[PDB]
Amino acid sequence: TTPDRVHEVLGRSMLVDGLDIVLDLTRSGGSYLVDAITGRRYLDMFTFVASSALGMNPPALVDDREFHAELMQAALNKPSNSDVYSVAMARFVETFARVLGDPALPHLFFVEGGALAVENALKAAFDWKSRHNQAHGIDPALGTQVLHLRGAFHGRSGYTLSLTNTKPTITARFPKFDWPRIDAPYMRPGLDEPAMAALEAEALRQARAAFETRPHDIACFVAEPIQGEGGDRHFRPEFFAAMRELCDEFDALLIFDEVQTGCGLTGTAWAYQQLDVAPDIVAFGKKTQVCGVMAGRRVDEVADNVFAVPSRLNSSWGGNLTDMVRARRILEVIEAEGLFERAVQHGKYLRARLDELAADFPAVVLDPRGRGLMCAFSLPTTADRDELIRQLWQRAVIVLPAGADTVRFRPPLTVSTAEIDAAIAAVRSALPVVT
Amino acid sequence: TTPDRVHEVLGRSMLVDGLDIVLDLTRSGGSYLVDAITGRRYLDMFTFVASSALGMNPPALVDDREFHAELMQAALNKPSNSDVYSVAMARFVETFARVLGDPALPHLFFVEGGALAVENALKAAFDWKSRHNQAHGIDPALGTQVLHLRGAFHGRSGYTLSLTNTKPTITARFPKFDWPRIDAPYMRPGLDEPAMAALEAEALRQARAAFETRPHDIACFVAEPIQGEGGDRHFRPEFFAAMRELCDEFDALLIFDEVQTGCGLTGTAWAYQQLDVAPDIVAFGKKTQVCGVMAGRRVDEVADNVFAVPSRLNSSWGGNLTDMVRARRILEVIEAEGLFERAVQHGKYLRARLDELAADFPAVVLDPRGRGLMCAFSLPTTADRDELIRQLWQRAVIVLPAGADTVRFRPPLTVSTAEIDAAIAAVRSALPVVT
Numbered sequence: 002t003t004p005d006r007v008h009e010v011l012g013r014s015m016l017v018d019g020l021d022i023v024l025d026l027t028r029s030g031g032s033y034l035v036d037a038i039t040g041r042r043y044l045d046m047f048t049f050v051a052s053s054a055l056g057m058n059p060p061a062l063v064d065d066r067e068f069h070a071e072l073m074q075a076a077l078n079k080p081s082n083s084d085v086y087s088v089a090m091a092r093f094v095e096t097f098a099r100v101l102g103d104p105a106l107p108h109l110f111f112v113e114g115g116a117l118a119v120e121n122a123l124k125a126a127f128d129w130k131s132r133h134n135q136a137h138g139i140d141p142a143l144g145t146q147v148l149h150l151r152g153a154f155h156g157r158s159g160y161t162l163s164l165t166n167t168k169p170t171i172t173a174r175f176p177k178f179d180w181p182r183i184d185a186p187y188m189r190p191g192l193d194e195p196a197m198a199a200l201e202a203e204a205l206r207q208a209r210a211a212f213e214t215r216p217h218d219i220a221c222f223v224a225e226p227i228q229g230e231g232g233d234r235h236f237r238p239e240f241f242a243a244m245r246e247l248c249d250e251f252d253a254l255l256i257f258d259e260v261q262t263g264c265g266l267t268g269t270a271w272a273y274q275q276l277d278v279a280p281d282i283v284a285f286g287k288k289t290q291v292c293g294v295m296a297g298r299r300v301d302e303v304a305d306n307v308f309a310v311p312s313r314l315n316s317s318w319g320g321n322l323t324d325m326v327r328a329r330r331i332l333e334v335i336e337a338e339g340l341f342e343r344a345v346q347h348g349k350y351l352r353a354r355l356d357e358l359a360a361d362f363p364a365v366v367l368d369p370r371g372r373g374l375m376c377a378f379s380l381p382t383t384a385d386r387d388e389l390i391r392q393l394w395q396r397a398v399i400v401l402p403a404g405a406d407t408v409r410f411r412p413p414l415t416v417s418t419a420e421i422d423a424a425i426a427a428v429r430s431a432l433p434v435v436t
Numbered sequence: 437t438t439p440d441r442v443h444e445v446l447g448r449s450m451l452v453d454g455l456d457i458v459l460d461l462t463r464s465g466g467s468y469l470v471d472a473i474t475g476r477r478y479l480d481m482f483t484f485v486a487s488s489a490l491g492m493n494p495p496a497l498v499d500d501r502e503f504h505a506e507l508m509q510a511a512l513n514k515p516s517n518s519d520v521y522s523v524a525m526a527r528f529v530e531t532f533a534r535v536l537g538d539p540a541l542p543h544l545f546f547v548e549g550g551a552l553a554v555e556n557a558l559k560a561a562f563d564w565k566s567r568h569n570q571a572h573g574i575d576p577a578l579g580t581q582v583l584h585l586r587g588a589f590h591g592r593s594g595y596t597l598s599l600t601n602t603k604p605t606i607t608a609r610f611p612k613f614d615w616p617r618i619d620a621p622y623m624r625p626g627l628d629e630p631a632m633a634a635l636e637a638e639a640l641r642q643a644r645a646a647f648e649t650r651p652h653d654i655a656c657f658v659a660e661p662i663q664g665e666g667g668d669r670h671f672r673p674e675f676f677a678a679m680r681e682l683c684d685e686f687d688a689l690l691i692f693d694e695v696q697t698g699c700g701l702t703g704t705a706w707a708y709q710q711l712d713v714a715p716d717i718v719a720f721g722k723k724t725q726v727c728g729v730m731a732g733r734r735v736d737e738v739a740d741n742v743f744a745v746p747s748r749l750n751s752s753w754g755g756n757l758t759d760m761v762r763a764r765r766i767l768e769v770i771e772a773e774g775l776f777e778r779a780v781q782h783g784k785y786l787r788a789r790l791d792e793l794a795a796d797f798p799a800v801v802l803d804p805r806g807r808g809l810m811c812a813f814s815l816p817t818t819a820d821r822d823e824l825i826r827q828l829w830q831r832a833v834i835v836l837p838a839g840a841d842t843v844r845f846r847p848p849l850t851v852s853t854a855e856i857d858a859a860i861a862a863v864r865s866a867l868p869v870v871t
């Protein structure tokens with residue numbers, strides 16, 4: 002099978018709606034994807050839907066002969082880490098705890114897939130609430146509902162389909178639980194402090210109303226600290242702090258879905274660290290390669306919780322050992338090279354350029370925004386947005402759409418300022434064409 | 437981190453309830469796991485919960501220098517196969533279709549994880565039923581329920597938690613849909629043809645009753661062709677053939693969950709091929725490394741089904757590329773070495789030995805059964821069963837429990853008759869001790 006036959010071969014078995022290239026696995030490197038058909042290089046602001054921290058074939062992994070041996074060792078087989086432990090696994094878990102750990106959240110659980118990471122956070126919360134109810138004389142059949150936001154994306158699995166509400170295509174015709182959903186009071190341009198406070202107070206009102214009309218039945222509140230797929234919607238720290246207080250008042254856990262924001266993209270290990278809100282459970286994935294949850298805070302108040310009792314949470318594999326070994330090495334690079342700090346500084350650079358774009362194209366480049374390297378801007382209509390992405394593609398720059406009118410940037414943590422300049426130059430070239 | 441410190445390090449972050457060994461990734465081979473602490477060798481009848489087809493470090497993979505290069509290439513990174521295609525991916529898909537494909541089921545979809553494979557089969561069915569309803573003047577809000585069996589195990593995710601019913605520990609305190617569940621008419625010892633027919637007719641009655649009391653609302657019937665976790669319960673081909681007819685009468689899809697039975701364990705690619713029943717959708721995983729579904733038959737009658745319309749099914753990664761590359765090579769070994777046929781012959785050998793065990797220990801070794809290499813027997817009580825497993829462990833043989841009183845054998849497809857003899861000898865030694 003040859004690069005030029007890839008789309009034909011796949012097309013016999015599956016819907017083939019992806020990018021028009023064939024990935025060269027060997028010649029791709031850093032912030033560049035190589036099309037194996039033409040040899041053309043593509044500037045990567047997409048990073049496998051934000052799942053690549055270092056970009057392709059990072060030198061620290063490719064040149065490391067000892068790591069090669071460890072990776073091969075892991076890659077040849079696929080143990081069930083659920084019941085069979087290894088040195089390779091233990092090294093990963095200890096470096097995860099060191100680099101990404103929170104002392105308040107000591108319980109770690111790993112699984113393949115971001116939606117299932119979120120599901121395990123939910124299951125922890127369902128169990129916690131039922132048992133907390135039981136211990137205080139409340140019916141243990143209560144504690145089965147999930148408070149969540151409009152415009153949320155938490156995945157495409159049985160429980161997360163009841164939470165995700167972006168494109169109808171994702172959720173239509175699939176059975177859902179009737180769980181309480183509230184307005185998302187995200188920052189928008191031309192809203193001052195009092196205006197934002199009023200917006201938040203209304204979501205808070207709706208949240209409080211949900212807790213009071215469904216007594217002892219809401220197990221948790223789940224949120225993205227910054228909504229990704231819904232359109233890079235950012236929230237003030239004040240909103241989540243108010244939600245944190247309200248969750249505690251009604252004995253509900255706070256879960257942050259950091260599958261997209263996590264592992265250094267915003268400039269810290271986790272976006273929540275910048276919002277000064279302490280969650281009870283964090284779900285992670287994408288850049289971490291292996292997915293899962295970190296849990297603690299109020300979780301430990303229920304002694305027979307899901308992390309203390311055998312066989313409550315499980316999967317056959319307990320995550321992919323190859324992913325663990327690769328992630329261990331990635332985390333070591335992040336720590337050794339100070340990549341979180343690099344994300345803060347280069348994020349400030351990218352944001353500044355998007356502000357300049359807004360100044361030069363004020364009716365077209367709307368609402369430039371970001372935290373660290375997680376940046377975006379919007380266009381007047383979805384047609385403009387879709388056209389801009391096509392024009393960037395022709396110029397060999399890969400970016401992703403979000404929501405109705407957003408273009409999002411997801412560069413690797415190792416992106417250089419020259420590479421950011423190249424992406425901005427491509428946007429400047431394309432804009433007169435779309436107008 | 438040293439082998440003797442593995443359990444200590446992991447114990448700081450997670451519940452450590454697995455096997456008492458530390459896996460030596462390099463020295464393990466074939467039907468033997470090596471404990472890195474002692475160097476003791478363990479006879480493997482467990483195969484990472486039936487997910488390993490060839491056992492550890494098979495020579496055809498370890499000695500193949502070209503494959504090493506391909507595997508390393510895939511292992512260094514983790515592309516989103518959902519939107520970025522590669523030669524490595526296309527080679528996998530084409531060899532999967534060749535070795536495991538069914539001409540009636542041309543639609544292939546891949547995902548990480550067995551439960552999510554089953555969930556995607558369900559989602560295909562929900563969409564199919566709603567749209568089939570709509571096209572025949574029936575309310576498209578109908579078609580949201582799943583007919584399933586008692587003692588079923590389909591996973592631990594949002595939708596499969598509503599199906600799985602083995603140990604209460606797996607499902608307790610998690611929100612479920614109220615879906616119709618019927619008795620499982622599995623073969624048991626000392627039941628003749630008429631007795632079995634009577635048992636099946638009763639399950640059939642219950643199935644028919646479910647279809648009639650929930651009109652147009654049952655999207656599919658899902659089953660394991662042989663129930664694994666529930667206790668290796670086998671069904672006559674007559675039962676599923678009757679279910680096949682009944683599904684067609686009420687316009688519902690038939691889904692086989694072949695995550696445990698699949699990829700050659702029973703002697704054919706899929707267990708369903710031996711039962712002479714044609715499903716509409718098959719979910720697969722474990723031995724396949726990448727998980728997913730094959731779909732066709734009645735699925736294609738709805739033109740805008742989930743395999744024809746973009747973005748209805750998805751995950752970020754679209755399965756693990758390292759898993760695909762390893763699976764491609766495994767499938768090539770299976771095909772080149774005739775491993776399906778090897779499973780039939782060695783399965784007959786194993787079964788014969790378990791019959792001899794039943795003859796020598798008639799009050800203790802109960803209900804010897806199996807299809808190909810998927811074999812089991814039961815003990816009088818769960819205490820006897822648990823003790824037998826402890827006694828086998830002391831003798832360095834790894835087997836798994838199932839249900840209340842079953843011991844299951846899950847050898848690799850490459851198991852030799854001498855290795856089967858060794859496992860049987862260990863059982864013979866242990867039995868007088870348990871009695």
Ligand SMILES: *Cc1c(COP(=O)(O)O)cnc(C)c1O
Nearest residue numbers: 114115116155156260261751752
């Ligand atoms: C994409 C993502 C998920 C789902 O992860 P998958 O691996 O595709 O299942 C969940 N939450 C957020 C915020 C995500 O970005």
Ligand SMILES: *Cc1c(COP(=O)(O)O)cnc(C)c1O
Nearest residue numbers: 316317549550551590591695696
């Ligand atoms: C174990 C298994 C699954 C679940 O697979 P996971 O990878 O653990 O999610 C589903 N169905 C059957 C029959 C299984 O054996």
